[PDB]
Design an enzyme around this catalytic site. Structure first.
Site, PDB file in Angstrom:
ATOM      1  N   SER B 154       0.874  -1.170   0.000  1.00 19.47           N
ATOM      2  CA  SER B 154       0.000   0.000   0.000  1.00 19.47           C
ATOM      3  C   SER B 154       0.904   1.210   0.000  1.00 19.47           C
ATOM      4  O   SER B 154       2.054   1.122   0.488  1.00 19.47           O
ATOM      5  CB  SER B 154      -0.846  -0.012   1.290  1.00 19.47           C
ATOM      6  OG  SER B 154      -1.490   1.217   1.496  1.00 19.47           O
ATOM      7  N   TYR B 167      -2.811  -1.019  10.037  1.00 17.52           N
ATOM      8  CA  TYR B 167      -2.711  -1.358   8.618  1.00 17.52           C
ATOM      9  C   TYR B 167      -1.418  -0.827   7.991  1.00 17.52           C
ATOM     10  O   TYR B 167      -0.669  -1.589   7.413  1.00 17.52           O
ATOM     11  CB  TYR B 167      -3.986  -0.948   7.817  1.00 17.52           C
ATOM     12  CG  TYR B 167      -3.894  -1.371   6.370  1.00 17.52           C
ATOM     13  CD1 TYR B 167      -4.094  -2.693   6.003  1.00 17.52           C
ATOM     14  CD2 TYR B 167      -3.562  -0.446   5.369  1.00 17.52           C
ATOM     15  CE1 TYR B 167      -3.994  -3.091   4.692  1.00 17.52           C
ATOM     16  CE2 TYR B 167      -3.448  -0.850   4.045  1.00 17.52           C
ATOM     17  CZ  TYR B 167      -3.656  -2.176   3.723  1.00 17.52           C
ATOM     18  OH  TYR B 167      -3.539  -2.570   2.415  1.00 17.52           O
TER      19      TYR B 167
END
Ligand SMILES: [Cl-]
Ligand code: NA
Ligand code: NA
Ligand code: NA
Ligand code: NA
Lengths: 242, 247
Positions: B154, B167
């Protein structure tokens, strides 16, 4: 070497907690912070392990540091909460947090690193670090000028073979620091940064002669810098000691 | 920009590829694309019922019956990962590709309010489980003539951002894991390891992460497949340790 000389009262009126304060770099930080006017809170597995460093800070003329014992490998969220309430009860304030403690675990290729070892390194280096920061953030957010320092590594910044979970946990640490720094920016008086201590003459570094590395005592410029008022506004930075 | 690679319809002929989080979204799209380019796919997800659609789609396109494996990432232990590997070994004798796509977001609260157990569970699922699965399958990947492991990352695994909870942290760990492993695999094996930032897609997980975004803004996951195909096929031999983008 990071270039900064601290005034002997640089940290006066500041309360700073150091993890992994028993030996090595953490011990040098506890001593130097105390030597510069900060009231220090010492974290370690047993009181016994913190007795020598505490005797050193006392010999130097500072009042008995606050000693808090925690098994980072075991400690529950509730224990960190109780730890924070102890700091609140004693000081009503926390101005500094130095995340120094961590374990390396086995130095084997990933294919050979036991699952339980990978998990334990991640827990001690990342999970415990998070839980400790979370528990203490309300106290740090009360401060007029607070600083959080995470310890990283070159292998936390560029992955290298056979560093097992250690390099991976130090990547995670940088990502935690960067996330935190972005939340703190502007809206709080708290700063978050990482310190790569580099090669030091410690039991831990003697990993990878030893005579080529400075004493941890000698890599204290950047440590003093981040905890004092001169680094106000420096946030989200990955810095080097050397 | 969209990764620049066009994959010929038999690109992946001769290859056995395991995809995690195969039931929906990017995982389902990659599973379908790999089968459509000639691969034998092993589908990993939580339940048989969750994997039925993707399996059915692959069989019907004529490609044929993929191997379905059930696993619970929050509580699978080495026993589960060992047994998974043994099943793959029994059927194929090797693995040519491993797409680590499964992950969870957790709460997107500020770190101060992120509950401790939510943080640890995200780290467990996104990192501990990824490591244990990698470790169980590495011997199979090493029996390949040309093997590829792709980790999903990400933008927040490369530059940290507020309110990404565990995350962003887990994706930083992911890049760390990938880099460490790439360095161990380089020159002494025929396995490469790289990461993929998929960017924005029209999926339930993207919608979870951005509750106020309209999914219409994002491309369908089946449209971001070029880097996914590149990394699994022979055109990426010798590309190792790289942090790539799908878009
Ligand atoms: Cl979806
Ligand atoms: Na001590
Ligand atoms: Na085990
Ligand atoms: Na959760
Ligand atoms: Na395993």
């Amino acid at each position: 070497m990071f270039d900064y000389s601290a005034h002997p009262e640089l940290l006066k009126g500041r309360v700073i907690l150091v993890t992994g304060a028993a030996r090595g770099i953490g011990a040098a930080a506890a001593r130097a912070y105390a030597a510069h006017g900060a009231s220090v809170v010492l974290l370690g597995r047993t009181e016994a392990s913190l007795a020598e460093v505490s005797d050193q800070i006392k010999s130097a003329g500072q009042p008995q540091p606050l000693i808090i014992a925690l098994n980072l490998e075991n400690a529950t969220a509730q224990q960190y909460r109780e730890l924070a309430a102890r700091v609140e009860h004693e000081f009503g304030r926390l101005d500094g947090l130095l995340h120094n403690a961590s374990i390396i675990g086995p130095r084997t290729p990933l294919e050979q690193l036991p699952d339980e070892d990978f998990m334990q390194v991640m827990h001690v280096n990342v999970n415990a670090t998070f839980m400790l920061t979370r528990a203490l953030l309300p106290l740090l957010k009360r401060s007029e000028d607070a600083s959080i320092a995470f310890t990283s590594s070159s292998v936390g910044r560029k992955g290298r073979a056979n560093w097992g979970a250690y390099g991976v946990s130090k990547f995670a640490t940088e990502g935690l620091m960067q996330t935190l720094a972005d939340e703190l920016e502007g809206v709080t008086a708290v700063r978050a940064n990482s310190i790569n201590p580099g090669a030091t003459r410690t039991g831990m570094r003697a990993a990878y002669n030893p005579l080529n590395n400075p004493a941890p005592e000698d890599i204290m410029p950047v440590y003093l810098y981040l905890m004092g008022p001169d680094s106000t506004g420096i946030n989200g930075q990955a810095l080097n000691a050397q």
